């Protein structure tokens, strides 16, 4: 009975004997005793091996978790919590672990439904239990502006009032934004803020009306309220845009990205790259060519969605591939490889696979289906970051991101019902080795290991949708 | 009175002299509608013709006025202007040597929001080139919905990646041993974007219950043949009955899916889920064709599942009227395909059950509007399985309201003109059967109920467009029932 642990470790092997009767990393395990409210449990930072790596060995003499950093030890304490099993037991085990990708991220949409600091802090602890080390907050969209800026003070004043569906809006104060980045730092997580521009910028026109263009509608139909110069409370996308040829548009992005970078010590500033429907490719090329350079000279590494990779601007910019794992193109396989030819890496977030906002085939009502139908937990796992990567190299993949969009999610219970269990397939694709190695990196194994951690998920207060695709305990 | 098809809602001649075109007329700056009018000057290779998009009136409606000073086409949409720009081409006449627009004022509006033409790519794979031309031909008659019959017992024509073996091993063949093929996802975007520029929506159909022999070629675990005692087989000579190998015949209702196998619905969800992502149009046509000998409860449970699958995808599902006895689906749209007299079954009653469910009817009577039905005159190809060949008059001898069981015109989504490709292997073959009688489709779709909507007037107006149809390269068949120019 191989002890179930997710993400699947690099090397795991049972031990010969009988199992184990039960700095600040110790607090992470002491607080982990929510699964179960002399012996000596060793948590030491030796160092020398790869970053975010650890070594776990459990016997009856003592259990020893040894990481190279505070992060590596913090991923070893997360593994031991999953290892915890008539009494309360830790199996005779030996784990030597290391991450496959340096970026192992979770995205949160705070613009569609404004999520408070508390429900964001909880999601940080939940993602950290799966060895995820990057929180991606989607701070702006057509439905709200969520970050408090002073170079653009009208934004937080007139663009944060509403949310999707007539629900409360709000924003993170700069006072409140430091709490998010310092809470995630204590969980060894970086916080990358995204400000979706060219398109996905309708709320920006509510406060600075000289910057936004009139909405382009196309075929709703579905609307039978379309977007106007008023707070958009719908879910349609790709209608808003900034005055791309107005220099005030870029003087706005400079203030917005300049002030934002001062509050984020993380290396990345995500600009988005969403283009409005019917926007010129050359004009959209000029847009993200300018704003990425603005972030470039700010001392930050710019991030954008892969649809802006054909552009001629930016150097070393990082991408977020949101296309399907079988890449059904507008050009999205070739367009994603433009980031690698330019000198940057790719973060892979396949829509059909890893988009956590996609409805379950089972049926928890929430979610969307715009990918290729609902997303089963298997399909969230039925992909390899290497083969589902056009024709690049593992050195050109910065990591894996698991986007959770909040068009339909308004609760922490709503967030957990959709993130888990499919978030485990995200951390597995991010942390665990490729599908070429690792015998436990199969659907038959993941489906069994993710079901054994079910009781552990219920003890930490983490909600999840029990997908009938897998067997729980 | 100047002939124009479909017959506009309100048309009246003017008091003065016509509009001389010459080589000095300017055309008003109306984006691509001017280019649509310039290409319409293929009939004939200062005063200015005004194309404007006002707005406020009915959807896809327009107003056309032609005098000696200037011509003005004013629509509420880009589609309304487009259909007004289409009426200009039909209006264009020749005085002696100069080309002339008659003094006339037209105020037009469509009767049905759905004005469809279906093309069968499964029996004979029609390339993107021959489909784009058919998009322009149907758009010249104010049709706004292209229905693609992407799959049948003879082939699978759309490229899916969740089910990638389909196009790998089910698109090799066509009926009669003819070339197969399929539309790539990249080739399918070109069709929907071309149709959008003509203000047409692309409705993709995947016949799901029966008409599914080709799916068994690639996913062999899903298919169930079933030969009836009738058939033709021995007489036609070999005429290979259906097997577990590509079917090159024309018989229908022999294949089916294992209705109680859950992989069949996980199959349909994957295909329809990927399909919906490729179509910005609101409609996903599921079919509803039941195999011979299928249990009514089983066929009901099948279409109950797939329509809910399409419904939960954010799209409106479409099916044939034979799937109306089912207990599933809500608000599903329908192509009624039975005769205008509503015959063998509760075919009218089963179609009226869709209206009880909250949906609308698209009516496509086989005896009336089936463009693949043989002419009584005789241009060879086509079928006659309805009630014999279909004359151009018989294609027009029906009212979409009266033939509609016992409902209301508000419960009719519109009109569809299906062209099945069992015998049609060329674009010239498509036009030889689609046209004349596709005007009777646009007439029933666009024009008011039974105006100039009589057989005596139709046969005069569509006969005047002969030179216009010959100028656009449309190879219509000259039915002897009507006089041309």
PDB file of C-alpha atoms in Angstrom, chain A residues 211-436:
ATOM      1  CA  UNK A 211      -9.455  56.208 -22.446  1.00  0.00           C
ATOM      2  CA  UNK A 212     -12.110  53.647 -23.409  1.00  0.00           C
ATOM      3  CA  UNK A 213     -13.684  52.919 -26.780  1.00  0.00           C
ATOM      4  CA  UNK A 214     -17.372  52.245 -27.277  1.00  0.00           C
ATOM      5  CA  UNK A 215     -18.256  48.546 -26.868  1.00  0.00           C
ATOM      6  CA  UNK A 216     -18.466  46.263 -29.895  1.00  0.00           C
ATOM      7  CA  UNK A 217     -21.372  43.874 -29.567  1.00  0.00           C
ATOM      8  CA  UNK A 218     -21.528  41.117 -32.225  1.00  0.00           C
ATOM      9  CA  UNK A 219     -24.131  38.421 -31.848  1.00  0.00           C
ATOM     10  CA  UNK A 220     -25.982  38.481 -28.582  1.00  0.00           C
ATOM     11  CA  UNK A 221     -28.690  37.027 -29.123  1.00  0.00           C
ATOM     12  CA  UNK A 222     -27.437  35.857 -25.710  1.00  0.00           C
ATOM     13  CA  UNK A 223     -28.291  39.299 -24.311  1.00  0.00           C
ATOM     14  CA  UNK A 224     -31.913  38.818 -25.412  1.00  0.00           C
ATOM     15  CA  UNK A 225     -28.156  43.974 -21.089  1.00  0.00           C
ATOM     16  CA  UNK A 226     -25.299  44.616 -23.523  1.00  0.00           C
ATOM     17  CA  UNK A 227     -22.348  46.769 -22.564  1.00  0.00           C
ATOM     18  CA  UNK A 228     -22.632  50.558 -22.507  1.00  0.00           C
ATOM     19  CA  UNK A 229     -21.004  53.424 -20.625  1.00  0.00           C
ATOM     20  CA  UNK A 230     -22.452  51.965 -17.426  1.00  0.00           C
ATOM     21  CA  UNK A 231     -21.268  49.167 -15.090  1.00  0.00           C
ATOM     22  CA  UNK A 232     -21.332  45.922 -17.069  1.00  0.00           C
ATOM     23  CA  UNK A 233     -22.922  43.172 -14.972  1.00  0.00           C
ATOM     24  CA  UNK A 234     -22.859  40.475 -17.667  1.00  0.00           C
ATOM     25  CA  UNK A 235     -20.358  37.788 -18.612  1.00  0.00           C
ATOM     26  CA  UNK A 236     -19.713  38.432 -22.315  1.00  0.00           C
ATOM     27  CA  UNK A 237     -16.067  39.078 -23.182  1.00  0.00           C
ATOM     28  CA  UNK A 238     -14.018  40.813 -25.844  1.00  0.00           C
ATOM     29  CA  UNK A 239     -16.139  43.944 -26.294  1.00  0.00           C
ATOM     30  CA  UNK A 240     -14.215  46.629 -24.400  1.00  0.00           C
ATOM     31  CA  UNK A 241     -10.903  48.198 -25.381  1.00  0.00           C
ATOM     32  CA  UNK A 242      -8.659  51.171 -24.703  1.00  0.00           C
ATOM     33  CA  UNK A 243      -8.044  53.972 -27.184  1.00  0.00           C
ATOM     34  CA  UNK A 244      -5.030  52.135 -28.584  1.00  0.00           C
ATOM     35  CA  UNK A 245      -3.763  55.117 -30.614  1.00  0.00           C
ATOM     36  CA  UNK A 246      -4.234  57.679 -27.821  1.00  0.00           C
ATOM     37  CA  UNK A 247      -0.971  58.354 -25.986  1.00  0.00           C
ATOM     38  CA  UNK A 248      -3.018  58.949 -22.825  1.00  0.00           C
ATOM     39  CA  UNK A 249      -3.861  55.228 -22.903  1.00  0.00           C
ATOM     40  CA  UNK A 250      -0.181  54.385 -22.439  1.00  0.00           C
ATOM     41  CA  UNK A 251       0.364  57.198 -19.935  1.00  0.00           C
ATOM     42  CA  UNK A 252      -2.397  55.455 -17.972  1.00  0.00           C
ATOM     43  CA  UNK A 253      -0.824  51.999 -18.229  1.00  0.00           C
ATOM     44  CA  UNK A 254       2.517  53.515 -17.203  1.00  0.00           C
ATOM     45  CA  UNK A 255       1.000  54.989 -14.038  1.00  0.00           C
ATOM     46  CA  UNK A 256      -1.020  51.828 -13.415  1.00  0.00           C
ATOM     47  CA  UNK A 257       1.880  49.421 -13.965  1.00  0.00           C
ATOM     48  CA  UNK A 258       4.439  51.769 -12.415  1.00  0.00           C
ATOM     49  CA  UNK A 259       2.553  52.140  -9.138  1.00  0.00           C
ATOM     50  CA  UNK A 260       1.592  48.458  -9.096  1.00  0.00           C
ATOM     51  CA  UNK A 261       5.187  47.231  -9.427  1.00  0.00           C
ATOM     52  CA  UNK A 262       6.156  49.176  -6.302  1.00  0.00           C
ATOM     53  CA  UNK A 263       3.737  47.039  -4.276  1.00  0.00           C
ATOM     54  CA  UNK A 264       4.743  43.637  -5.720  1.00  0.00           C
ATOM     55  CA  UNK A 265       8.253  42.326  -4.922  1.00  0.00           C
ATOM     56  CA  UNK A 266       7.578  39.368  -7.228  1.00  0.00           C
ATOM     57  CA  UNK A 267       9.408  39.323 -10.562  1.00  0.00           C
ATOM     58  CA  UNK A 268       6.253  39.316 -12.707  1.00  0.00           C
ATOM     59  CA  UNK A 269       3.677  41.911 -13.727  1.00  0.00           C
ATOM     60  CA  UNK A 270       0.895  40.447 -15.869  1.00  0.00           C
ATOM     61  CA  UNK A 271      -0.458  42.810 -18.535  1.00  0.00           C
ATOM     62  CA  UNK A 272      -2.980  40.424 -20.096  1.00  0.00           C
ATOM     63  CA  UNK A 273      -3.025  40.867 -23.853  1.00  0.00           C
ATOM     64  CA  UNK A 274      -6.754  40.406 -24.445  1.00  0.00           C
ATOM     65  CA  UNK A 275      -7.735  41.981 -27.766  1.00  0.00           C
ATOM     66  CA  UNK A 276     -11.235  43.241 -28.483  1.00  0.00           C
ATOM     67  CA  UNK A 277     -13.262  41.515 -31.180  1.00  0.00           C
ATOM     68  CA  UNK A 278     -12.619  43.122 -34.546  1.00  0.00           C
ATOM     69  CA  UNK A 279      -9.412  44.855 -33.450  1.00  0.00           C
ATOM     70  CA  UNK A 280      -6.591  45.224 -35.960  1.00  0.00           C
ATOM     71  CA  UNK A 281      -3.680  42.831 -35.506  1.00  0.00           C
ATOM     72  CA  UNK A 282      -1.179  45.623 -36.187  1.00  0.00           C
ATOM     73  CA  UNK A 283      -2.901  47.913 -33.678  1.00  0.00           C
ATOM     74  CA  UNK A 284      -3.090  45.114 -31.110  1.00  0.00           C
ATOM     75  CA  UNK A 285       0.571  44.409 -31.871  1.00  0.00           C
ATOM     76  CA  UNK A 286       1.424  48.055 -31.173  1.00  0.00           C
ATOM     77  CA  UNK A 287      -0.492  47.975 -27.873  1.00  0.00           C
ATOM     78  CA  UNK A 288       1.191  45.071 -26.083  1.00  0.00           C
ATOM     79  CA  UNK A 289       4.485  46.046 -27.735  1.00  0.00           C
ATOM     80  CA  UNK A 290       4.339  49.316 -25.791  1.00  0.00           C
ATOM     81  CA  UNK A 291       2.952  48.200 -22.430  1.00  0.00           C
ATOM     82  CA  UNK A 292       5.280  45.209 -22.071  1.00  0.00           C
ATOM     83  CA  UNK A 293       8.218  47.553 -22.663  1.00  0.00           C
ATOM     84  CA  UNK A 294       6.755  49.787 -19.941  1.00  0.00           C
ATOM     85  CA  UNK A 295       6.815  46.840 -17.535  1.00  0.00           C
ATOM     86  CA  UNK A 296      10.248  45.860 -18.881  1.00  0.00           C
ATOM     87  CA  UNK A 297      11.927  49.154 -17.946  1.00  0.00           C
ATOM     88  CA  UNK A 298      10.193  49.021 -14.540  1.00  0.00           C
ATOM     89  CA  UNK A 299      12.476  46.194 -13.400  1.00  0.00           C
ATOM     90  CA  UNK A 300       9.715  43.582 -13.737  1.00  0.00           C
ATOM     91  CA  UNK A 301       9.235  40.609 -16.040  1.00  0.00           C
ATOM     92  CA  UNK A 302       6.048  41.120 -18.088  1.00  0.00           C
ATOM     93  CA  UNK A 303       3.409  38.419 -18.459  1.00  0.00           C
ATOM     94  CA  UNK A 304       0.670  38.278 -21.090  1.00  0.00           C
ATOM     95  CA  UNK A 305      -1.778  35.836 -22.620  1.00  0.00           C
ATOM     96  CA  UNK A 306      -0.454  33.885 -25.589  1.00  0.00           C
ATOM     97  CA  UNK A 307      -2.678  35.756 -28.080  1.00  0.00           C
ATOM     98  CA  UNK A 308      -0.097  38.595 -28.033  1.00  0.00           C
ATOM     99  CA  UNK A 309       2.915  36.475 -29.026  1.00  0.00           C
ATOM    100  CA  UNK A 310       2.880  37.391 -32.710  1.00  0.00           C
ATOM    101  CA  UNK A 311       3.706  40.981 -31.709  1.00  0.00           C
ATOM    102  CA  UNK A 312       7.001  42.644 -32.570  1.00  0.00           C
ATOM    103  CA  UNK A 313       7.523  44.262 -29.177  1.00  0.00           C
ATOM    104  CA  UNK A 314       8.615  43.028 -25.742  1.00  0.00           C
ATOM    105  CA  UNK A 315      11.802  41.070 -24.997  1.00  0.00           C
ATOM    106  CA  UNK A 316      11.828  37.995 -22.783  1.00  0.00           C
ATOM    107  CA  UNK A 317       8.136  38.378 -21.957  1.00  0.00           C
ATOM    108  CA  UNK A 318       6.414  35.420 -20.291  1.00  0.00           C
ATOM    109  CA  UNK A 319       3.169  33.990 -21.666  1.00  0.00           C
ATOM    110  CA  UNK A 320       0.087  32.246 -20.366  1.00  0.00           C
ATOM    111  CA  UNK A 321      -1.115  29.710 -22.921  1.00  0.00           C
ATOM    112  CA  UNK A 322      -4.878  29.353 -22.469  1.00  0.00           C
ATOM    113  CA  UNK A 323      -5.524  27.223 -25.565  1.00  0.00           C
ATOM    114  CA  UNK A 324      -6.688  23.623 -25.542  1.00  0.00           C
ATOM    115  CA  UNK A 325      -4.325  20.762 -24.807  1.00  0.00           C
ATOM    116  CA  UNK A 326      -4.779  19.603 -28.420  1.00  0.00           C
ATOM    117  CA  UNK A 327      -4.190  23.295 -29.469  1.00  0.00           C
ATOM    118  CA  UNK A 328      -7.121  23.958 -31.866  1.00  0.00           C
ATOM    119  CA  UNK A 329      -5.661  26.999 -33.503  1.00  0.00           C
ATOM    120  CA  UNK A 330      -6.432  30.457 -34.370  1.00  0.00           C
ATOM    121  CA  UNK A 331      -2.635  30.216 -34.628  1.00  0.00           C
ATOM    122  CA  UNK A 332      -2.238  29.549 -30.948  1.00  0.00           C
ATOM    123  CA  UNK A 333       0.462  26.873 -31.174  1.00  0.00           C
ATOM    124  CA  UNK A 334       2.583  29.053 -33.463  1.00  0.00           C
ATOM    125  CA  UNK A 335       1.588  32.215 -31.585  1.00  0.00           C
ATOM    126  CA  UNK A 336       2.651  30.729 -28.244  1.00  0.00           C
ATOM    127  CA  UNK A 337       6.060  29.831 -29.698  1.00  0.00           C
ATOM    128  CA  UNK A 338       6.671  33.505 -30.478  1.00  0.00           C
ATOM    129  CA  UNK A 339       7.356  34.037 -26.776  1.00  0.00           C
ATOM    130  CA  UNK A 340      10.070  31.362 -26.855  1.00  0.00           C
ATOM    131  CA  UNK A 341      11.709  32.718 -30.017  1.00  0.00           C
ATOM    132  CA  UNK A 342      11.725  36.169 -28.388  1.00  0.00           C
ATOM    133  CA  UNK A 343      13.649  34.949 -25.335  1.00  0.00           C
ATOM    134  CA  UNK A 344      10.920  34.157 -22.785  1.00  0.00           C
ATOM    135  CA  UNK A 345       9.275  31.116 -21.245  1.00  0.00           C
ATOM    136  CA  UNK A 346       5.714  29.801 -21.364  1.00  0.00           C
ATOM    137  CA  UNK A 347       3.275  29.217 -18.525  1.00  0.00           C
ATOM    138  CA  UNK A 348       0.833  26.585 -19.769  1.00  0.00           C
ATOM    139  CA  UNK A 349      -2.826  26.773 -18.714  1.00  0.00           C
ATOM    140  CA  UNK A 350      -4.895  24.677 -21.139  1.00  0.00           C
ATOM    141  CA  UNK A 351      -8.531  25.768 -21.175  1.00  0.00           C
ATOM    142  CA  UNK A 352     -10.054  22.333 -21.742  1.00  0.00           C
ATOM    143  CA  UNK A 353      -7.618  20.810 -19.231  1.00  0.00           C
ATOM    144  CA  UNK A 354      -6.684  23.177 -16.416  1.00  0.00           C
ATOM    145  CA  UNK A 355      -9.347  25.929 -16.446  1.00  0.00           C
ATOM    146  CA  UNK A 356     -10.959  25.394 -13.034  1.00  0.00           C
ATOM    147  CA  UNK A 357     -14.019  27.515 -13.903  1.00  0.00           C
ATOM    148  CA  UNK A 358     -15.264  24.867 -16.351  1.00  0.00           C
ATOM    149  CA  UNK A 359     -18.406  23.025 -15.291  1.00  0.00           C
ATOM    150  CA  UNK A 360     -18.142  19.436 -14.135  1.00  0.00           C
ATOM    151  CA  UNK A 361     -19.750  16.702 -16.248  1.00  0.00           C
ATOM    152  CA  UNK A 362     -21.074  15.444 -12.894  1.00  0.00           C
ATOM    153  CA  UNK A 363     -23.082  18.560 -12.087  1.00  0.00           C
ATOM    154  CA  UNK A 364     -22.501  21.164  -9.384  1.00  0.00           C
ATOM    155  CA  UNK A 365     -24.422  23.731 -11.478  1.00  0.00           C
ATOM    156  CA  UNK A 366     -21.634  26.326 -11.269  1.00  0.00           C
ATOM    157  CA  UNK A 367     -18.967  26.877 -13.907  1.00  0.00           C
ATOM    158  CA  UNK A 368     -18.866  27.376 -17.657  1.00  0.00           C
ATOM    159  CA  UNK A 369     -18.514  25.139 -20.709  1.00  0.00           C
ATOM    160  CA  UNK A 370     -16.997  27.391 -23.391  1.00  0.00           C
ATOM    161  CA  UNK A 371     -13.915  25.173 -23.829  1.00  0.00           C
ATOM    162  CA  UNK A 372     -15.070  21.908 -25.419  1.00  0.00           C
ATOM    163  CA  UNK A 373     -17.831  21.038 -22.992  1.00  0.00           C
ATOM    164  CA  UNK A 374     -17.530  20.333 -19.280  1.00  0.00           C
ATOM    165  CA  UNK A 375     -14.115  19.341 -17.943  1.00  0.00           C
ATOM    166  CA  UNK A 376     -13.885  15.947 -16.275  1.00  0.00           C
ATOM    167  CA  UNK A 377     -11.247  15.467 -13.587  1.00  0.00           C
ATOM    168  CA  UNK A 378      -9.548  12.973 -15.915  1.00  0.00           C
ATOM    169  CA  UNK A 379      -9.168  15.526 -18.717  1.00  0.00           C
ATOM    170  CA  UNK A 380      -7.711  17.993 -16.210  1.00  0.00           C
ATOM    171  CA  UNK A 381      -5.064  15.265 -15.829  1.00  0.00           C
ATOM    172  CA  UNK A 382      -5.169  13.887 -19.402  1.00  0.00           C
ATOM    173  CA  UNK A 383      -2.338  16.098 -20.632  1.00  0.00           C
ATOM    174  CA  UNK A 384       1.427  16.448 -20.367  1.00  0.00           C
ATOM    175  CA  UNK A 385       2.994  19.948 -20.245  1.00  0.00           C
ATOM    176  CA  UNK A 386       5.627  18.698 -22.708  1.00  0.00           C
ATOM    177  CA  UNK A 387       3.533  17.188 -25.518  1.00  0.00           C
ATOM    178  CA  UNK A 388       0.698  19.700 -25.007  1.00  0.00           C
ATOM    179  CA  UNK A 389       3.403  22.279 -25.764  1.00  0.00           C
ATOM    180  CA  UNK A 390       3.504  23.009 -29.554  1.00  0.00           C
ATOM    181  CA  UNK A 391       7.109  22.198 -30.432  1.00  0.00           C
ATOM    182  CA  UNK A 392       9.245  23.801 -27.739  1.00  0.00           C
ATOM    183  CA  UNK A 393      11.497  22.485 -24.970  1.00  0.00           C
ATOM    184  CA  UNK A 394      11.121  21.909 -21.239  1.00  0.00           C
ATOM    185  CA  UNK A 395      13.597  24.758 -20.707  1.00  0.00           C
ATOM    186  CA  UNK A 396      11.111  27.049 -22.502  1.00  0.00           C
ATOM    187  CA  UNK A 397       8.251  26.223 -20.094  1.00  0.00           C
ATOM    188  CA  UNK A 398       8.286  28.454 -17.019  1.00  0.00           C
ATOM    189  CA  UNK A 399       5.532  26.381 -15.429  1.00  0.00           C
ATOM    190  CA  UNK A 400       1.829  25.669 -15.077  1.00  0.00           C
ATOM    191  CA  UNK A 401      -1.032  27.943 -14.010  1.00  0.00           C
ATOM    192  CA  UNK A 402      -4.513  26.851 -12.912  1.00  0.00           C
ATOM    193  CA  UNK A 403      -6.989  29.673 -13.671  1.00  0.00           C
ATOM    194  CA  UNK A 404     -10.108  29.995 -11.525  1.00  0.00           C
ATOM    195  CA  UNK A 405     -12.521  32.527 -13.024  1.00  0.00           C
ATOM    196  CA  UNK A 406     -15.250  34.082 -10.880  1.00  0.00           C
ATOM    197  CA  UNK A 407     -18.033  34.723 -13.394  1.00  0.00           C
ATOM    198  CA  UNK A 408     -20.052  32.093 -11.534  1.00  0.00           C
ATOM    199  CA  UNK A 409     -18.193  31.773  -8.191  1.00  0.00           C
ATOM    200  CA  UNK A 410     -19.278  34.100  -5.371  1.00  0.00           C
ATOM    201  CA  UNK A 411     -18.426  32.069  -2.235  1.00  0.00           C
ATOM    202  CA  UNK A 412     -15.374  30.462  -0.702  1.00  0.00           C
ATOM    203  CA  UNK A 413     -17.521  27.329  -0.745  1.00  0.00           C
ATOM    204  CA  UNK A 414     -18.202  28.111  -4.408  1.00  0.00           C
ATOM    205  CA  UNK A 415     -14.475  28.593  -5.043  1.00  0.00           C
ATOM    206  CA  UNK A 416     -13.550  25.305  -3.361  1.00  0.00           C
ATOM    207  CA  UNK A 417     -16.286  23.299  -5.103  1.00  0.00           C
ATOM    208  CA  UNK A 418     -14.715  24.133  -8.486  1.00  0.00           C
ATOM    209  CA  UNK A 419     -10.988  24.433  -7.724  1.00  0.00           C
ATOM    210  CA  UNK A 420     -10.719  21.038  -6.032  1.00  0.00           C
ATOM    211  CA  UNK A 421     -10.262  18.236  -6.971  1.00  0.00           C
ATOM    212  CA  UNK A 422      -9.122  19.379 -10.432  1.00  0.00           C
ATOM    213  CA  UNK A 423      -6.546  21.695  -8.830  1.00  0.00           C
ATOM    214  CA  UNK A 424      -4.583  18.579  -7.836  1.00  0.00           C
ATOM    215  CA  UNK A 425      -4.097  17.667 -11.500  1.00  0.00           C
ATOM    216  CA  UNK A 426      -2.702  21.195 -11.882  1.00  0.00           C
ATOM    217  CA  UNK A 427      -0.154  20.872  -9.076  1.00  0.00           C
ATOM    218  CA  UNK A 428       0.669  17.371 -10.331  1.00  0.00           C
ATOM    219  CA  UNK A 429       1.356  18.656 -13.845  1.00  0.00           C
ATOM    220  CA  UNK A 430       3.338  21.507 -12.280  1.00  0.00           C
ATOM    221  CA  UNK A 431       5.293  19.726  -9.538  1.00  0.00           C
ATOM    222  CA  UNK A 432       5.499  16.047 -10.483  1.00  0.00           C
ATOM    223  CA  UNK A 433       7.791  14.728 -13.255  1.00  0.00           C
ATOM    224  CA  UNK A 434       6.649  14.245 -16.843  1.00  0.00           C
ATOM    225  CA  UNK A 435       4.473  11.381 -18.053  1.00  0.00           C
ATOM    226  CA  UNK A 436       7.574   9.661 -19.462  1.00  0.00           C
TER     227      UNK A 436
END
